[PDB]
Write a protein that binds this DNA or RNA. Structure first.
Ligand SMILES: C[NH+](C)c1cc(NC(=O)CNC(C)(C)C)c(O)c2c1C[C@H]1C[C@H]3[C@H]([NH+](C)C)C(O)=C(C(N)=O)C(=O)[C@@]3(O)C(O)=C1C2=O
Ligand SMILES: [K+]
Ligand SMILES: [Mg+2]
Ligand SMILES: [Mg+2]
Ligand SMILES: [Mg+2]
Ligand SMILES: [Mg+2]
Ligand SMILES: [Mg+2]
Ligand SMILES: [Mg+2]
Ligand SMILES: [Mg+2]
Ligand SMILES: [Mg+2]
Ligand SMILES: [Mg+2]
Ligand SMILES: [Mg+2]
Ligand SMILES: [Mg+2]
Ligand SMILES: [Mg+2]
Ligand SMILES: [Mg+2]
Ligand SMILES: [Mg+2]
Ligand SMILES: [Mg+2]
Ligand SMILES: [Mg+2]
Ligand SMILES: [Mg+2]
Ligand SMILES: [Mg+2]
Ligand SMILES: [Mg+2]
Lengths: 50, 171, 555, 115, 326, 101, 132, 49
RNA sequence: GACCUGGCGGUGCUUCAUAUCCCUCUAGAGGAGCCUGUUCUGUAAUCGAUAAACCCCGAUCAACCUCACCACCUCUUGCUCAGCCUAUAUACCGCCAUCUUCAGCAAACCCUGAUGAAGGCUACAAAGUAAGCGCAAGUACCCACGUAAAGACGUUAGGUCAAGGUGUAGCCCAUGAGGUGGCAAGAAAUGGGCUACAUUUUCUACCCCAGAAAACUACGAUAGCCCUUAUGAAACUUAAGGGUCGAAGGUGGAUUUAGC
RNA sequence: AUAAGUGGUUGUUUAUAAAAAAAUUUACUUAA
């Protein structure tokens, strides 16, 4: 389409949190979970509204 | 709540209690054993309590070359369908309360003398339908293990023979 | 519109129809539940709001007797609620607006005092003289032009032509001009009412036109289409008058729609050998319409293409069919091909004409494009593709045609499962084709064996039986071919002379005198006149003297 | 009898067909419609990745079969019609901020859900 | 007769890939290979495997961390496990005279290598003896580790004695190749600034600190960390002793100018990142023997010792909560 | 049809607290300043202390929406740790995995 | 010993699917997510409402196609759209499948106020990855 | 809205369009208990006054 | 009587022991005050965990609510095609502890023991072949390292009917539902922690070249009283700040934890 | 070659079973 475009990767985010592994006691035993968010930025330049 | 309802597989596994510490080491001594019932057995998709007739699912899609419309069985008619469903279930259960006559060997509760039929057919088409197989002795023999403890094995003695001079036995 | 699974893909035209009805049936049950239990669907999560994924409410929610509450029952097309409320409202003595009364009349007349059926709760005259609509007009104190017009139009739909004409008289007595729609409805009434010849109807028509001009009523497209629609009864006397009508519209400025030409081409295409008059007109019509984008203007615009194609195929005009099809594929014209019936008809005829009058290579191109992409064949249109393959002397494809035949639900069709064998056995072929047709042969053998019709009556065309046997011999499955002999005797199906004649060679190729004797012994039992001629050849070729007398002693 | 499934239509597909017609828009991977012997799945020991048919791993991919290079170029040709041209006078950012000193920023947030 | 329930012993479908089965797979790959090139708008006749992998990766994007779990479209011979061919004919006679040993391939090889040694008596780096897992694939026979070891002993016993060209090429069938990595420091390009002064620049990393150093070929001993004299940026002596270390070791205190930037970490991790960045940039202006000595002094290695995560249910990276016997 | 009566009592608290929020806001504003006369703020104190106790928003409890658990709930999903894990461990929560580092 | 979403070993006779054969520590390693939306991404909203919808639909589909599903649903969301990708068996009449596709799609679109589609993929039998 | 999810899925079961394996399980158990005589007593008209 | 298998032996020999034995190294706990569990006492006034593998444990958390408790007052087809935090974790699912800081569990065969319970090892090899499941490999994090994660079958009827669900038994004018108020204290005894006892310290400046302090507001309370503020409808209670107040404590008995 | 005492009670193997639901009209408009 004749648009000028540059791409880079912003650094990722890894959000972790811990939960208890058992229903009742055993506080020393945990399960840990994460959600990775990966990125890519498309830098377009000099565009008209249409 | 709709969201606390589980599946039949999860429900029977808990209710039957096949696993647990009771099973191990014969800790549980309750002979009475429930059996899983498939409650989906006689169920027809589209068949419900209100008796609606859905064209293409519960009833045929086309009638006389014409597409049927939503219809609902009469109250008196629905009673018969529900009453009939009860009968089939009962008779289905009836089949499973009938006790089978196990031909007895040397004694009523003995395995000796009972027949095991012909030996299983061999790999390369070898066949043994000439031979009969009678049990001679069943014994629960035990060993001790470091982890479990009393480990049961079954030692069985059978004899095979065609009745024409050829016979053997094995444990 | 179908699910794209090998197991849910429709495999016949019946399924193609049946699967779409099942999907639509489930949607009615959904819509039935959604509208029967609105409260379970009254939680709007959408942004922006989607009005069409909300439940519908069909019951009037205002029970107070007022003019506004009347509009609800009219808008909600609740015939019973309106009349009951109207009766009470009239007893109260309150005044009902003329417009409000007119709207109430339209609903009562349009449906002939018959409540439109929805969700859940033909032959003969449906109109009844003692109907409420008639009574309401008497109670109506003021009757405007719309009152007369609306009443006549409904009478036409319910075949109450005679009184509609009488009611039209009262309109004239009031010196009231009728609308365009009233005239269009009246045109059908006069023609459909009586079965007079065209000339008598033609005069009556001209009388109304003079009234129309006198009343300064400007005609519509429908106005003329109704004329052409009625003129199909006089299938030869209205031809020339029709050409006047067509040219007249073009003069006024009203461009003919597809419905117009539909009536025309139907009218001119009567049982006849030459049909050259029609022919010319069809050609001219298509030349006129080349590269013309159409818009829906008349309810019958969908029936054009199926008729056009039918005539094209009757005249066997391959170059004209390409123009008809060429027009359909321009712009958004394909949307006029109509329901599934119309669509199969079109493509069925269109393709029959292709197979007959087109090069084989181009027929196979159209074969791959149309099926099953656009059209699920019928049993016949496989036969035509077979014949066209024979005429082109391209029998290397017949195997493929058999597979496709199964894949479109024609595995058991009697007519089709025979032609394939005949053509495959008619002639000898190179080893390859011979073997190829022999594999196809066993494939069709399975079908004859597992016939579902066997539950009714197992049919075994001796010709089909012959072809199989021949092909099994040409492959080397003599043992399997010999098993067919048992089946002949079993079904009591005498073999064909050609099969019997070719059975001699089978023994020669095998050079097994033992088998040769078995063939003659069995054939002789049936005392077939052709068998006797064979026996003479066998006796000359190979026959033991001791065996000959044994055969004679049985006689 | 028991309804038999037809063969996959990948067999009736020409090795030179236009693939964009088969998957015009974004649609879930269908084994019966993709003529690739693609396998996915961590293999059992002395085994192979699992065949496309019934492979739930392949159905969990958001595939790009509706956006092949061919398809994209074709698409963008039909869309050149919609777009207008950048003022050739506004070559550099220097020229942009000479003629247009103000800049207005705003963000649009594309996310999946009913709202 | 008591009918015992027949156990479905062969539940597990055992891997059986008939030669015909493979050929139907190679057929489908070739047909599929052409469809893949067609979708990608490329020439079906030059579509290499690396084009198959790039295309499959794009059309079925998966982030699964294991590569063996991702979608693949490979030649059936690179996918299916190699299988031993039928070892006997229709009559039932095995084709190999060592069939009944169970390992005709391994013992055939052992028989051969033994003979080659026997004949020799009648006549008179960068390469590795293939591992066992390789020999088993070359022989298609599941092999014992003690089998392997005995086999290799013959081979080595073969090398010791004199061998002809024919024997050496045999041994080479089992001698693989090992690419040897050089522990030789890569030297940074010498560059030139606007005034024609020679410098090299390198990077260093220590914990969460990152340093970039520009070392000038000639100078006075001026280090300027983040635009500040090194003595003012690092008021702690130990920090300044770390910046001395690279230049002192090669006898170049007072001969170079350094401009570094560092960020992250604490003061002492910054000193060690700058030490590494300066040492690396300094490698361009010393001899290759001095570079090696700097490598053997530990001046050119990235320190991998970084903070270890705390674990749950513990007090620290290693520290446990108090354990209560009772 | 809520999981239990403790959830049902929270359903009602959340609903009543919503009904009175504007009134409660307006009355707090009067008594949350130094501008107004104290004799007026004292009336406001009385007025808001007379609104039903279940309109007080601090009485809302964030219970698991599936099992009604009053503690151990992650607020982004409104689920207890037992229920969250059950979905997370079967692969049914988009983009949520076991963390290892 | 861990238990969550592990199918135990048994006696070499238990058919298990690729999905069932993998424990939660394989969810981004050897297998993917049965749902895909944007709620659980950094900065995104409505993860809770997505999660309640996904728990209902799985339940809805399990009882609406009784005995037909051969594995777990794959739930997808793109903007306003919702895609339900089932793998079903080949025992029900295709007439019944079409009824249920049309029914479920319609009912769910009015319930969750969005365009909802349902892509079936029939298999003969449940695809067995491993005999545990 | 737990009132809507239970009431919807209850009519869908009474309509025949939803199979509730859990409610089927509980109905079976309820049916068996009734046979054993362990049926719920009528409210108010109970054993006690 | 004689065996088989396991266990155990203050049983032999030989190797070992990794912050997994001893001698070694560093910082702590056991004494003080405080904080927070538990027990015991009390109260009309919850339940669970309770050698290792309970004891800042369910709780990533209780002023009301939460709540299940107690007192009083109400309701009866009742938010629900009811309900029950009633009994039974020794009927169970679900999710886990524990060995495990393990390497073993093994179907199917074949052989040995006179065809006993059982057993199956030698590489210059003598009866074992074994598919699967663990370990391993792979993957996550910053690497081939390390740390995670993983870790079978079983053992401890180990924990959890009070996450939810549920078999069995029980309650149904009440063992259910709701409102108002209230308890949740300390003679103490013990577990874990926080802060100290000071000179490698205290206070300011600076965040590393300073000035002061240093046994009568030296060091030392995050504790008591007072005030204010924050949140809340509600704070004598909860938290933050300020002031006031300068307590015990002067490196802690038997014993005891952690770390490569 | 030091010395190391004790542990209420109680406890295990009685026998096998299975379902299907399903298929008449394969192409118009039209008229009396
Ligand atoms: C009376 N004893 C023999 C017993 C009985 C039952 N339950 C019944 O018999 C119940 N009977 C009904 C069903 C009510 C009729 C029991 O359920 C139990 C026990 C024993 C306990 C012992 C528990 C013990 N501690 C916590 C007090 C313990 O430390 C152990 C241990 N292994 O170290 C236990 O086993 C113990 O926790 C436990 O589980 C017991 C029971 O389960
Ligand atoms: K219970
Ligand atoms: Mg663990
Ligand atoms: Mg530490
Ligand atoms: Mg012993
Ligand atoms: Mg302490
Ligand atoms: Mg202490
Ligand atoms: Mg307590
Ligand atoms: Mg307790
Ligand atoms: Mg307990
Ligand atoms: Mg204990
Ligand atoms: Mg209670
Ligand atoms: Mg237990
Ligand atoms: Mg348990
Ligand atoms: Mg007991
Ligand atoms: Mg590693
Ligand atoms: Mg771990
Ligand atoms: Mg591992
Ligand atoms: Mg217990
Ligand atoms: Mg004593
Ligand atoms: Mg004892």
């Amino acid at each position: 389409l004749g648009i000028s475009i540059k791409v880079h990767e912003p650094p990722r985010k890894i959000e972790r949190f811990t939960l208890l592994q058992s229903v009742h006691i055993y506080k020393k035993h945990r399960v840990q979970y994460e959600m990775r968010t990966l990125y890519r930025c498309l830098e377009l330049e000099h565009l008209t509204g249409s | 709540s709709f969201f606390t309802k589980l599946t039949a597989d999860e429900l029977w596994k808990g209710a039957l209690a096949e696993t647990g510490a009771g099973a191990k080491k014969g800790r549980g001594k309750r002979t009475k054993k429930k059996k899983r019932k498939d409650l989906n057995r006689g169920q027809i998709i589209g068949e419900g309590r209100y008796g609606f007739l859905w064209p293409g699912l519960n009833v045929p899609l086309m009638k006389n070359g014409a597409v049927q419309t939503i219809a609902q069985r009469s109250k008196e008619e629905q009673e018969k369908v529900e009453a009939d469903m009860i009968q089939q279930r009962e008779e289905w259960d009836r089949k499973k309360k009938m006790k089978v006559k196990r031909e007895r060997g040397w004694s009523g509760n003995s395995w000796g003398g009972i027949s095991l039929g012909p030996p299983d057919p061999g790999p390369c088409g070898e066949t043994y339908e000439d031979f009969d197989t009678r049990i001679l002795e069943v014994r629960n023999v035990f060993t001790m293990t470091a982890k479990e403890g009393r480990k049961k094995s079954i030692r069985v003695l059978v004899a095979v023979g065609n009745g024409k001079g050829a016979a053997g036995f094995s444990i | 519109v179908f699910q794209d699974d090998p197991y849910l893909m429709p495999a016949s035209s019946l399924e193609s129809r049946s699967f779409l009805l099942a999907k639509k049936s489930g949607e009615n049950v959904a819509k039935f539940i959604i509208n029967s239990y609105p409260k379970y669907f009254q939680k709007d999560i959408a942004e922006p709001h989607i009005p069409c994924l909300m439940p519908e409410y069909f019951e009037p929610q205002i029970k107070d007797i007022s003019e506004a509450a009347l509009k609800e029952r009219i808008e909600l097309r609740k015939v019973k609620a309106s009349v009951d409320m109207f009766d009470q409202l009239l007893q109260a003595g309150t005044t009902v607006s003329l417009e409000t009364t007119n709207s109430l009349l339209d609903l009562l007349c349009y449906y002939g005092d018959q409540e439109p059926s929805t969700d859940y709760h033909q032959f003969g005259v449906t109109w009844r003289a003692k109907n409420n609509a008639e009574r309401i007009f008497s109670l109506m104190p003021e009757k405007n032009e719309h009152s007369y017009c609306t009443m006549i139009r409904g009478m036409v739909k319910h075949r109450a032509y005679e009184q509609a004409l009488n009611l039209y008289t009262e309109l004239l007595n009031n010196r009231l001009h009728a609308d365009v729609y009233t005239f269009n409805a009246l045109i059908e009434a006069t023609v459909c009412a009586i079965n007079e010849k065209f000339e008598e109807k033609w005069s009556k028509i001209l009388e109304l036109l003079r009234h129309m001009v006198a009343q300064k009523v400007k005609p519509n497209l429908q106005t003329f289409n109704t004329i052409l629609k009625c003129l199909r009864r006089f299938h030869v006397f209205a031809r020339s008058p029709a050409l006047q009508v067509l040219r007249e519209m073009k003069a006024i400025g009203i461009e003919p729609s597809l419905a117009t030409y539909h009536h025309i081409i139907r009218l001119f295409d009567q049982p006849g050998d030459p049909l050259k008059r029609s022919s010319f007109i069809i050609y001219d019509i298509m030349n006129e319409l080349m590269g013309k984008r159409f818009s829906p203007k008349d309810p019958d615009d969908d029936k054009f293409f199926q008729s056009a194609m039918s005539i094209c195929s009757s005249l066997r005009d391959l170059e004209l069919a390409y123009q008809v099809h060429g027009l359909l594929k321009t712009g958004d014209n394909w949307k006029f091909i109509g329901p599934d019936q119309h669509r199969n008809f079109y493509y069925s005829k269109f393709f029959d004409l292709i197979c007959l009058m087109e090069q084989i290579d181009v027929t196979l191109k159209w074969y791959e494009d149309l099926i099953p992409s656009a059209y699920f064949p019928h049993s016949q249109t496989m036969i035509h593709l077979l014949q066209a393959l024979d005429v082109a002397n391209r029998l290397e494809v017949i195997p493929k045609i058999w597979k496709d035949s199964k894949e479109y639900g024609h595995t058991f069709r009697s007519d089709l499962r025979e032609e394939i064998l005949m053509l495959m056995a008619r002639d000898k072929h190179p080893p390859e084709l011979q073997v190829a047709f022999a594999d196809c042969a066993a494939d069709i053998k399975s079908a004859y064996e597992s016939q579902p019709i066997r539950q009714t009556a197992q049919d075994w065309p001796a010709t089909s039986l012959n072809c199989i046997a021949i092909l099994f011999l040409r492959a080397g499955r003599t043992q399997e071919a010999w098993k067919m002999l048992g089946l002949f005797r079993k079904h009591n199906k005498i073999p064909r002379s050609e099969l019997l004649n070719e059975l001699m060679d089978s023994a020669k190729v095998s050079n097994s005198p033992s088998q040769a004797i078995e063939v003659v012994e069995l054939a002789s039992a049936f005392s077939l006149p052709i068998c006797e001629g064979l026996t003479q050849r066998v006796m000359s070729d190979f026959a033991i003297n001791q065996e000959q007398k044994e055969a004679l002693s049985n006689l | 009898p028991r309804r038999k499934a037809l063969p996959p239509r990948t067999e009736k597909m020409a090795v030179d067909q236009d693939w964009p017609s088969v998957y015009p828009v974004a649609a879930p991977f269908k084994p019966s419609a993709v003529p690739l012997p693609v396998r996915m799945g961590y293999p059992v020991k002395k085994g192979v990745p699992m065949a496309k048919e019934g492979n739930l791993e392949l159905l969990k991919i958001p595939n790009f079969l509706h956006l092949t290079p061919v398809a994209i170029k074709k698409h963008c040709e039909a869309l050149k019609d919609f777009c207008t041209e950048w003022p050739a006078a506004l070559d550099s950012d220097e020229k942009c901020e000479k003629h247009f000193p103000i800049e207005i920023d705003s963000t649009d947030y594309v996310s999946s859900g009913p709202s | 007769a008591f009918v015992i329930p027949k156990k479905n012993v062969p539940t597990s479908k055992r891997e059986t890939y008939t030669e015909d089965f493979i050929k139907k797979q190679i057929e489908e790959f070739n047909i599929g290979k052409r469809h893949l090139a067609n979708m990608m708008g490329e020439d079906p006749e030059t579509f290499t495997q690396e084009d198959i992998d790039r295309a499959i990766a794009y059309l079925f994007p998966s982030g699964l961390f294991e590569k063996r779990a991702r979608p693949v479209m490979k030649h059936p011979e690179q996918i299916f496990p190699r299988q031993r061919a039928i070892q006997w004919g229709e009559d039932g006679r095995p084709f190999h005279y060592l069939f009944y040993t169970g390992k005709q391939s391994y013992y055939s090889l052992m028989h051969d290598v033994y003979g080659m040694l026997l004949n020799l008596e009648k006549h008179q780096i960068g390469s590795r003896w293939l591992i066992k897992e390789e020999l088993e694939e070359m022989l298609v026979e599941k092999l014992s580790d003690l089998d392997y070891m005995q086999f290799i002993r013959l081979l080595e016993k073969l090398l010791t004695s004199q061998c002809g060209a024919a024997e050496e090429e045999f041994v080479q069938r089992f001698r693989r190749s090992v690419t040897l990595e050089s522990k030789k420091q890569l030297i940074e390009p010498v560059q030139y600034d606007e005034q024609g002064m020679a410098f090299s620049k390198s990077e260093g990393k220590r914990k969460t600190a990152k340093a970039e150093a520009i070392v000038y070929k000639h100078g006075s001993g001026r280090i300027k960390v983040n635009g500040i004299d090194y003595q003012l940026y690092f008021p702690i002596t130990q920090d300044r002793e770390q910046l001395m270390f690279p230049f002192h070791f090669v006898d170049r205190l007072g001969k170079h100018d350094v401009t570094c930037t560092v960020s992250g970490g604490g003061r002492s991790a910054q000193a060690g990142a700058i030490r590494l960045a300066m040492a690396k940039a300094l490698c361009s202006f010393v001899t290759e023997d001095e570079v090696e000595w700097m490598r053997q002094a530990g001046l050119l290695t990235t320190d991998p010792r970084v903070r270890e995560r705390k674990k749950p249910g513990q007090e620290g990276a290693r520290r446990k909560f108090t354990w209560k016997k009772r | 049809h809520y999981v239990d009566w403790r959830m049902w009592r929270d359903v009602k608290r959340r609903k009543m607290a919503y009904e009175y929020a504007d009134e409660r806001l307006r009355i707090n504003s009067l008594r949350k300043n130094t501008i107004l006369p104290k004799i007026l703020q004292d009336v406001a104190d009385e007025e808001i202390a007379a609104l039903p106790r279940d309109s007080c928003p601090v009485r809302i409890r964030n219970r698991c929406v599936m099992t009604s658990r009053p503690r151990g709930v992650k607020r982004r999903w409104r689920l207890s740790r037992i229920v969250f894990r059950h979905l997370a461990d079967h692969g049914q929560l988009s983009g949520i995995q076991r963390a290892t580092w | 010993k861990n238990r969550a979403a592990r199918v135990r070993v048994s006696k070499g006779d238990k058919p298990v699917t690729y999905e069932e054969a993998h424990a939660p520590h394989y969810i981004a390693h050897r297998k993917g997510w049965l749902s895909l939306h944007t709620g659980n991404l950094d900065g995104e909203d409505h993860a809770a409402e997505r999660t309640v919808e996904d728990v209902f639909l799985r339940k809805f589909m399990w009882g609406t196609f009784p005995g037909c599903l051969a594995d777990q649903l794959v739930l997808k969301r793109r903007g306003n759209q919702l895609e339900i990708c089932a793998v079903v068996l080949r025992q029900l009449s295709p007439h019944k499948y079409y009824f249920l596709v049309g029914y479920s799609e319609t009912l769910l679109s009015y319930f969750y106020k969005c365009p909802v589609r349902l892509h079936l993929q029939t298999v003969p039998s449940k695809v067995v990855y491993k005999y545990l | 809205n737990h009132h809507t999810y239970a009431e919807l899925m209850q009519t869908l079961r009474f309509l025949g369009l939803y199979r509730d394996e859990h409610q089927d399980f509980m109905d079976e158990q309820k049916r068996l208990k009734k046979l054993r005589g362990k049926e719920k007593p009528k409210k108010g008209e109970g054993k006690r006054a």
